[PDB]
């Protein structure tokens, strides 16, 4: 779109917290096809896809990070396993089940934009002949899957989720995962899909894939991949100091979130400073004593928090509970110390 | 639904003996959908279900409480077993088979719910132009189908039985478990699948995954599924006396069906006190001696109870039969201390 | 149906002989469901059916006296091999083929109880506008599909046959079998199908599970399962007396049919009663010197009998055979005693 | 078409950088299509096309060649892994896939070539009755179908990618590679498949084969394959020099493109000698300090080059960058003489 | 056709160099469907197909035979690989896609031979009401089909290759070879397949089934395989004499095509005597020098051969190339002594 590099990453730090290197990175793949656009043929169809390949941990913002761009970009988006496409059998859906599920979003994304959007006209006309059966109106499924079929082709974004989990001494003898980036390869090497919505060319793409390769490295990807994943970015580990501004800057962070939820009951909750310390170095402190699984184990630990008033609000009708350092130290208790209970309850 | 958290509890309290933790669990989920109703865009669809994962035994009310859930909340509910996914083949279907199958019931719920509802003029019109030919009025398959894939996107929920069983040294070169997590994943993760109803979007599908996890633990899920099970709740073996109260409290409870079916013979049974304590002690003395099945115990040895006279009331009509604790002991009798007998006979 | 426990037994002691247990088993279970309409709601949907586990030799009368019991009821059946649902593959039809099976026979239970039923007017308005281009009148396949669906729903009958043979240290690195029940599991604990007449709910479906259970026992069946298997029967072992009886009191007993057959080409066959013991006695022998395969061996036996007679009786009208124990003896002979030719022969 | 190998190879010139003796293959191959046509009936069907062994390593142009020739004869192209048929299953497509795909570009290629081509009426009668409603005029699938089936049958061109990974003492027990070739066979030996354009023929179909072959020879191909395969062409390593060409010659050239592209955030960037000469050092540099993956490592090189700048363009419009030497061995830096990075990196 | 034995053979002899008693066995089979046709009923039906089992080194011709056969008895031809029907799978398509194909065809032969046959009136009726739009007369899908399945009902001929290769001690733990048989016989044995044009009739179709039986005996093929193949014939390798000979008398020879191909330059092209015989000695001795695949070699050395003018022909109008045994000598040169090379360039 027309939003510029620091447009888009200013976008991006509301709502993911560090990982500037990421943010960079799909802003510059993201703008990088409002360039295109702007150039001519054949320069135009000519130049491809700036594919990105982040390499992190688990829990790190690799997902929130394309999820957001997508959104930030009207974009058709989807998440997929690359596993998926290992597992004894392949007797399900192909790679093109990637393409299709990807058009089928780009339709539902011009249909809720549009069935309010050139509706300037959803009253006045809908009745008088309420309104409802107005919207199928303009509509014209022949003009409706065309932009599908062009937003896909034009704005798709792939997250190819976990790809370093399908490449490679009896651990050699299993090279079906090689057999997988290639037929993964088409996809990201332009080619055309059918689809119940006409034909899509998945050649002008975005594809985001991530993986940890703490086992692999890129460079072992079959070579036709990495010459495709023009990006390389990296992104860090989150300090206990992350989760605390994970926890309340993001916009509909969790405190927002539970703060807002309460509010429905009649209950107005506030989180003291240090509290907030407290549940983020919680969600850390399990981390490192067990398996860390990044800002996820936030979830958890703060359900676990709300737990008490989560129940009762009901009951609690205009009041306001504080949850301090020691409401969570009591909430929490035992249960961050002792590694049987975490294990089970967080 | 405007049911509140203690209200919810109350209802299931009618039907689930003890476990009050897993209770309240479900019922904070529950109510967690009224107050995000009740929030707006952004941060309504922002807010996402709050998944549960029941940890417990066999028997002890896990899938119970679901379903009673999934009734008082007129919601289309589905079963699952997480192993289905696995069996060498996985050529049948899929995950998404879950959100077909729950779509599908979502529809079945709207129709019964609407043939016999809005039909405030099943009389009257149906005829004197007898009824049955006038249910196909109103209907609108448009308009059916639309609530219908509404209703399993707002309120479906999906219950995925022993999970445990599809996790993590010969053991470990069988990781396709993981890979069926992974193709879980999407749907917890929220995402769209093609149904003969339309587009339903799992995005606010309410997720409760139970298992005994004696074999693993919650921490040995793939990270994905940990996010995503943010509510952990475990729940506890029931006691003898836990059966005594199964056994007649629990609206519709055994005691009360074989009563009722009786009672159509023209019989009147009644259960003496002390032969409910009989009958409840055989089906745990029978779970520790053998096998531990739980409160199912309880339906071999009713019916093994029950035998005698559900067979010849039609010859007993106007009598009354007095179930003491000695028709108890004899109705039963060798069976239960025999190992060899109740292996086959309970 | 409107019958009692004890004249479905007298139904049945005219086709099946011994298996007293068994037959008490059954008519409970199908009684259960007349006192299940009479019942109100919830408590009509709430009582379940009273499934069976019958448990005994291959050749006593297990699916006979299922079969005899679907007839007696007007309801549709269907037996089922459990095994078919693990051998490698399952490529072709999960546990969902059984509820459709048994939804189609109950569609042509419909039909023909139809086409020949309210067709009170197949005469006198069939022609003089012969009869046959009538039938395609009233039926109204809104109305047919609906009761079929509505009769396996309420009256379905499914036979699941060797189901210990899906069950449970080299032998234990096989639990696929125990996946197997998992896909069964659905089935039997209620829920719904899609099928070319409509959606029918498995939810009323009286499941009849036997099993030689030699090898495993009921008690190692996943615990969902023993807890829909309320009902457990024993079926016993059937003497040389049992044969002597099945082979003439049955209606349409062996005896019956031969002389019947025979009848047809103008011979008048007869069994002397020392004929019959000495039939019954050679089945006998031959399945404890072999393979007992229970009142099966009848039926090569009684072929080999009436081998020669079945040949000629054109050659004889007007004749009357008196097949006496000699007559036996000798067609029967070496073949008996002889194992070598038993095992090709018999 | 009427273009002469002389002038194929000019035009390739234009686009790929040295293999002469394949520019030579391809070009004799495709210009054999023009004297086919010349040629008289039987002799004209008789003529089979004269199929090509690319034999060279990854990254030299083997693909390139193969696309841009189909470009220049506005032919229906498709490129394929033969690896793809092999992956243990087979249950998805098979070898018709090819042939379907092929088709489907055809029609995809008489399309577009007429939505603009024959509509020398898309103005002066599309309105006045704007236009794209018009497109929908003089199509006649009936026509259109035909010359796309026409197209591939008299056209196609194929490109089987690493076909020397299909062929063939414990690495011996596996033929099924030889099975793949064998259902390659029918394809490359002419034959008939249906296609939902038609009936296509790929008898006079022009297939490019390509393999490293460092593993085995194309002479361990099964016999019917190498009769296929006329043309045997070799192509060569590419040299830092031929990096340094490439990276500015060939139309549409990483030049060019960055060129473009920041031209549109309103930099205008420019390359030194020395500079280019240093990129292309450092792509060959990493190839042979690690793993060699020939012209692609341009891509991630390229792109960390172009990092920085790509971010920021938009805050320098009216600038006018020029990386030389120096620009480049910062921008690049350690990342080179460091394999642990580059294997990420690069 | 009313073709004699001895006019086939002549037909034959103008493709075929050699392999007489083969042209000899497809002459007879061929000539018996005419004679067959003569008879009366029953004796008409009651003849089988005269099958045929070729067994010869590859390259000697026993698929062109077979392919000629066809084309002078317009006749519906199809090849097929015998292992295409064991590769671990099965999951495409049985031994009915044979029927299929070979179907299809048959109509594509009634179609081609009909759109350009009874349209005695292409003209004078086209237009005036050009062409084209014509063709779209007097067709009949309903006469055109019956023809097509009379077709191949009565002149079909399938082509199974390699059949050697699924026969018949760890080689002998692998009977699924026999079970392939198995799964042919039905076809050979005639019967019924269901196909889009309706249902043809295996049961007098002409199968020719070849293998090497290098490893193999026909007298391992399973016993009903061996009834359908009546005739047995055997062809021989080929002399360098017959490479000789191939090289310039059948019809469309390599030479008489490269000569056409060139001239369509406007390059006249000449074969020394001499050069043809070192042609043919290249052939050969690079057959024995390394895999002898027989007549195929002849493809890559005279591509070899005819490559440099092949290429510059265009700039060469109005010259006289001789190719004389200097110029081939020269054109393959260290090629040929040259395993090294051989095994790549030939
Ligand atoms: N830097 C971050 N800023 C905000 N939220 C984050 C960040 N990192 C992780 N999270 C949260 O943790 C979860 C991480 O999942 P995701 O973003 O897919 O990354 P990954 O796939 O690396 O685990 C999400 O719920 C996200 O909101
Ligand atoms: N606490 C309880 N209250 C009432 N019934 C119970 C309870 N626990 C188990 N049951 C009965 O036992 C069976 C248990 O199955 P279910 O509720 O699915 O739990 P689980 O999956 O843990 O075995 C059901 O028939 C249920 O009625
Ligand atoms: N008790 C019996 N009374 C009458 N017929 C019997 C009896 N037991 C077996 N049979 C006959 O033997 C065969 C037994 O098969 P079936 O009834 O399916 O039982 P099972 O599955 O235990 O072998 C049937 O043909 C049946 O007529
Ligand atoms: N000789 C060359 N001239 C121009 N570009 C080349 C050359 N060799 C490789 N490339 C570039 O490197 C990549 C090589 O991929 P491709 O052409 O498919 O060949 P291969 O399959 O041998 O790796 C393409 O992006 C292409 O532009
Ligand atoms: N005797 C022959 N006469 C003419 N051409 C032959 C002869 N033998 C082989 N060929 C040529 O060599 C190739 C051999 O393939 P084919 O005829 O299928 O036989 P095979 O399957 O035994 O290799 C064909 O291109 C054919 O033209």
Redesign the interface.
Known sequence: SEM???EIVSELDQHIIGQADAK?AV??AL??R???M??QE??RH??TP?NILM?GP??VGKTEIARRLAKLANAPFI???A??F?????????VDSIIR?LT??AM?LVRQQEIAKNRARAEDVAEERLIDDEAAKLINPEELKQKAIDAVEQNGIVFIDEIDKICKEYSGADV?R???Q??L??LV?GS?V?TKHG?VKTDHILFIASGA?QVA???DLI??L???????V?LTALSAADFERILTEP??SLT??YK??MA??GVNIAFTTDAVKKIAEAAFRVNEK??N??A?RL??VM??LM?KI???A??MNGQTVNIDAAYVADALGEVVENEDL?????
């Open positions: 510029t590099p620091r960079r802003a510059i703008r990088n409002w360039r295109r702007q150039l054949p320069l000519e130049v700036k390499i688990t829990g998440k997929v396993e596993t998926k290992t597992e004894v059998g392949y007797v399900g859906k192909e599920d089928d979003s539902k079906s090689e057999g997988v290639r037929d390869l088409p090497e055309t059918s034909m390769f490295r890129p460079s070579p036709e990495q010459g495709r994943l023009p990006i390389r990296e916009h509909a927002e979130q807002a939820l429905t009951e067990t398996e699984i990044g996820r979830h958890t359900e676990r737990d989560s129940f009762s009901s009951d975490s294990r089970f309850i967080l």
